[PDB]
Design an enzyme around this catalytic site. Structure first.
Site, PDB file in Angstrom:
ATOM      1  N   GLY A  97       0.779  -1.224   0.000  1.00  0.00           N
ATOM      2  CA  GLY A  97       0.000   0.000   0.000  1.00  0.00           C
ATOM      3  C   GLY A  97       0.818   1.285   0.000  1.00  0.00           C
ATOM      4  O   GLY A  97       0.286   2.337   0.381  1.00  0.00           O
ATOM      5  N   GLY A  99       2.206   2.611  -2.743  1.00  0.00           N
ATOM      6  CA  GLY A  99       1.938   3.300  -3.988  1.00  0.00           C
ATOM      7  C   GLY A  99       2.638   2.701  -5.209  1.00  0.00           C
ATOM      8  O   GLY A  99       2.755   3.362  -6.238  1.00  0.00           O
ATOM      9  N   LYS A 100       3.098   1.457  -5.134  1.00  0.00           N
ATOM     10  CA  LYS A 100       3.774   0.881  -6.290  1.00  0.00           C
ATOM     11  C   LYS A 100       2.797   0.668  -7.432  1.00  0.00           C
ATOM     12  O   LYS A 100       2.965   1.246  -8.505  1.00  0.00           O
ATOM     13  CB  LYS A 100       4.465  -0.433  -5.906  1.00  0.00           C
ATOM     14  CG  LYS A 100       5.625  -0.241  -4.931  1.00  0.00           C
ATOM     15  CD  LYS A 100       6.216  -1.563  -4.525  1.00  0.00           C
ATOM     16  CE  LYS A 100       5.159  -2.438  -3.875  1.00  0.00           C
ATOM     17  NZ  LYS A 100       4.797  -1.884  -2.560  1.00  0.00           N
ATOM     18  N   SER A 101       1.771  -0.142  -7.188  1.00  0.00           N
ATOM     19  CA  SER A 101       0.756  -0.455  -8.189  1.00  0.00           C
ATOM     20  C   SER A 101       0.023   0.756  -8.759  1.00  0.00           C
ATOM     21  O   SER A 101      -0.563   0.705  -9.837  1.00  0.00           O
ATOM     22  CB  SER A 101      -0.253  -1.417  -7.594  1.00  0.00           C
ATOM     23  OG  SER A 101      -1.406  -1.472  -8.396  1.00  0.00           O
ATOM     24  N   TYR A 102       0.060   1.859  -8.040  1.00  0.00           N
ATOM     25  CA  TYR A 102      -0.596   3.028  -8.550  1.00  0.00           C
ATOM     26  C   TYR A 102       0.407   3.763  -9.422  1.00  0.00           C
ATOM     27  O   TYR A 102       0.042   4.382 -10.409  1.00  0.00           O
ATOM     28  CB  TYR A 102      -1.066   3.919  -7.403  1.00  0.00           C
ATOM     29  CG  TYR A 102      -1.927   5.090  -7.865  1.00  0.00           C
ATOM     30  CD1 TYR A 102      -3.261   4.901  -8.274  1.00  0.00           C
ATOM     31  CD2 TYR A 102      -1.406   6.389  -7.894  1.00  0.00           C
ATOM     32  CE1 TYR A 102      -4.047   5.981  -8.695  1.00  0.00           C
ATOM     33  CE2 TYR A 102      -2.188   7.474  -8.315  1.00  0.00           C
ATOM     34  CZ  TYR A 102      -3.501   7.256  -8.703  1.00  0.00           C
ATOM     35  OH  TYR A 102      -4.260   8.337  -9.042  1.00  0.00           O
ATOM     36  N   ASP A 239       6.571  -4.620 -10.852  1.00  0.00           N
ATOM     37  CA  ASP A 239       5.815  -4.243  -9.676  1.00  0.00           C
ATOM     38  C   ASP A 239       6.268  -5.197  -8.568  1.00  0.00           C
ATOM     39  O   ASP A 239       5.675  -6.267  -8.364  1.00  0.00           O
ATOM     40  CB  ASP A 239       4.308  -4.386  -9.996  1.00  0.00           C
ATOM     41  CG  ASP A 239       3.400  -3.855  -8.898  1.00  0.00           C
ATOM     42  OD1 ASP A 239       3.430  -4.394  -7.764  1.00  0.00           O
ATOM     43  OD2 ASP A 239       2.633  -2.898  -9.173  1.00  0.00           O
ATOM     44  N   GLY A 242       5.637  -6.265  -1.511  1.00  0.00           N
ATOM     45  CA  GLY A 242       5.713  -5.359  -0.382  1.00  0.00           C
ATOM     46  C   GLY A 242       7.052  -5.594   0.276  1.00  0.00           C
ATOM     47  O   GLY A 242       7.350  -6.720   0.639  1.00  0.00           O
TER      48      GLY A 242
HETATM   49  N1  LIG Z   1       0.520   9.009  -5.984  1.00  0.00           N
HETATM   50  C1  LIG Z   1      -0.676   8.664  -5.515  1.00  0.00           C
HETATM   51  N2  LIG Z   1      -1.751   9.512  -5.746  1.00  0.00           N
HETATM   52  C2  LIG Z   1      -3.009   9.168  -5.270  1.00  0.00           C
HETATM   53  N3  LIG Z   1      -3.340   8.090  -4.579  1.00  0.00           N
HETATM   54  C3  LIG Z   1      -2.261   7.245  -4.355  1.00  0.00           C
HETATM   55  C4  LIG Z   1      -0.948   7.455  -4.767  1.00  0.00           C
HETATM   56  N4  LIG Z   1      -0.139   6.404  -4.347  1.00  0.00           N
HETATM   57  C5  LIG Z   1      -0.983   5.576  -3.674  1.00  0.00           C
HETATM   58  N5  LIG Z   1      -2.255   6.034  -3.632  1.00  0.00           N
HETATM   59  C6  LIG Z   1      -3.458   5.403  -3.084  1.00  0.00           C
HETATM   60  O1  LIG Z   1      -3.118   4.320  -2.310  1.00  0.00           O
HETATM   61  C7  LIG Z   1      -3.751   3.124  -2.710  1.00  0.00           C
HETATM   62  C8  LIG Z   1      -2.795   2.005  -2.780  1.00  0.00           C
HETATM   63  O2  LIG Z   1      -1.491   2.323  -3.234  1.00  0.00           O
HETATM   64  P1  LIG Z   1      -0.896   1.100  -4.032  1.00  0.00           P
HETATM   65  O3  LIG Z   1      -0.361   1.629  -5.332  1.00  0.00           O
HETATM   66  O4  LIG Z   1      -1.984   0.085  -4.299  1.00  0.00           O
HETATM   67  O5  LIG Z   1       0.248   0.376  -3.173  1.00  0.00           O
HETATM   68  P2  LIG Z   1       1.073  -1.010  -3.288  1.00  0.00           P
HETATM   69  O6  LIG Z   1       1.376  -1.258  -4.750  1.00  0.00           O
HETATM   70  O7  LIG Z   1       2.372  -0.918  -2.530  1.00  0.00           O
HETATM   71  O8  LIG Z   1       0.196  -2.103  -2.693  1.00  0.00           O
HETATM   72  C9  LIG Z   1      -4.574   3.387  -3.972  1.00  0.00           C
HETATM   73  O9  LIG Z   1      -5.909   2.837  -3.819  1.00  0.00           O
HETATM   74  C10 LIG Z   1      -4.426   4.927  -4.180  1.00  0.00           C
HETATM   75  O10 LIG Z   1      -5.648   5.696  -4.202  1.00  0.00           O
END
Ligand SMILES: Nc1ncnc2c1ncn2[C@@H]1O[C@H](COP(=O)(O)OP(=O)(O)O)[C@@H](O)[C@H]1O
Length: 313
Positions: A97, A99-102, A239, A242
């Site tokens: 969580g 922000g990788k996947s985003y 990707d 964690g």
């Molecule tokens: N740069 C960003 N801008 C807006 N929301 C973000 C951003 N990075 C993360 N988030 C929020 O956090 C959530 C999860 O981040 P995510 O990419 O899924 O993490 P991870 O890949 O490590 O599991 C998303 O549902 C998103 O709305």
């Protein structure tokens, strides 16, 4: 040349706001600083990188780093070198969580497409604008998931343990992993989604899974004289898992991540597979949580991001 490193700070999630956390990440210029909540007395340690993206606030804010802004620098740069015939690698590193996947994939709306979709769309854009009839392109994509040393094809679930192999003369490869020739951003976009939800404790997508999406960009240049030149580029947009089932791949990475530029390359499917990323132009985007409650985890990554930057392929 070396390996560019970029970091990102996202907004608070539901858990962070439910604990009323405070922001402990600061960024100015290309430098990001971090504060110790459980020791507000200690000097906030600062790290400097090629990019210190500030996306804590929102797209309404002016100093927010929109995903389009992060692609343009890193992504739109790797495609350039791909076209240049070079091998490229962009891997999101971080905490669950974080922000990788985003950052990589992102969302399909509100102009929220991550690095991957933007690179694809940009690849084909750059391709159909091709006027020189002496040029023809080939684009075959793959999309696998490495969940605990096991490899799983996200584009051909209709089957698998898929063994990672080592061609005597052509390096590592996941045998039977499908490669699908696409002829447009639309066809390569569907594969994404259908492959997305594919990905294998916690809920939704297993925290401990690596998802490699590779594109073998093939360029063919002909000319009446009289041979056609061919130069292929492999594009690995990953990707990672964690950074904390076993997924000792990521832990095995830390070891490979070190000693930049022996190396236990075969101690993990991921480290072995992306062995070349070696001869390649790599980029690392470290995803950071603004949460104080992530002191250690968030600091760890930074220290990791600081070492990676010290690499140079
Ligand atoms: N740069 C960003 N801008 C807006 N929301 C973000 C951003 N990075 C993360 N988030 C929020 O956090 C959530 C999860 O981040 P995510 O990419 O899924 O993490 P991870 O890949 O490590 O599991 C998303 O549902 C998103 O709305």
């Amino acid at each position: 040349a070396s390996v560019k490193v970029a970091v990102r700070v996202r907004p608070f999630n539901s858990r962070e706001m439910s604990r009323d956390s405070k922001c402990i990440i600061q960024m100015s210029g290309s430098t990001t600083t971090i504060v110790n909540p459980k020791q507000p007395k200690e000097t906030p340690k600062s790290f400097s990188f090629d990019y210190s993206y500030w996306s804590h606030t929102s797209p309404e804010d002016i100093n927010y780093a929109s995903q389009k802004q992060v692609y343009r620098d890193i992504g739109e740069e790797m495609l350039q070198h791909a076209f240049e015939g070079y091998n490229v690698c962009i891997f999101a590193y971080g905490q669950t969580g974080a922000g990788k996947s985003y950052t990589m994939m992102g969302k399909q709306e509100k102009d929220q497409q991550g690095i991957i979709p933007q690179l694809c769309e940009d690849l084909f854009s750059r391709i159909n604008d091709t006027t020189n009839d002496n040029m023809s392109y080939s684009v075959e994509v793959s999309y696998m998931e490495i969940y605990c040393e096991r490899v799983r094809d996200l584009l051909n679930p209709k089957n698998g343990n898929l063994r990672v192999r080592e061609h005597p003369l052509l390096g590592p490869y996941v045998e039977d992993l499908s490669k699908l020739a696409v002829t447009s951003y639309n066809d390569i976009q569907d594969l994404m989604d259908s492959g997305n939800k594919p990905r294998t404790n916690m809920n939704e997508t297993s925290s401990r899974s690596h998802a490699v999406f590779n594109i073998i960009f093939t360029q063919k240049r002909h000319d009446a004289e009289n041979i056609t030149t061919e130069k292929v580029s492999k594009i690995s947009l990953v990707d990672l898992a964690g950074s904390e089932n076993i997924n000792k791949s990521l832990t095995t990475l830390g070891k490979v991540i070190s000693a930049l530029a022996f190396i236990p390359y075969r101690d993990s499917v991921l480290t072995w597979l992306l062995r070349e990323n070696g001869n390649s132009r790599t980029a690392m985007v470290a995803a950071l949580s603004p949460a104080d409650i992530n002191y250690d985890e968030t600091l760890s990554t930074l220290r990791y991001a600081d070492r990676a930057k010290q690499i140079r392929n």
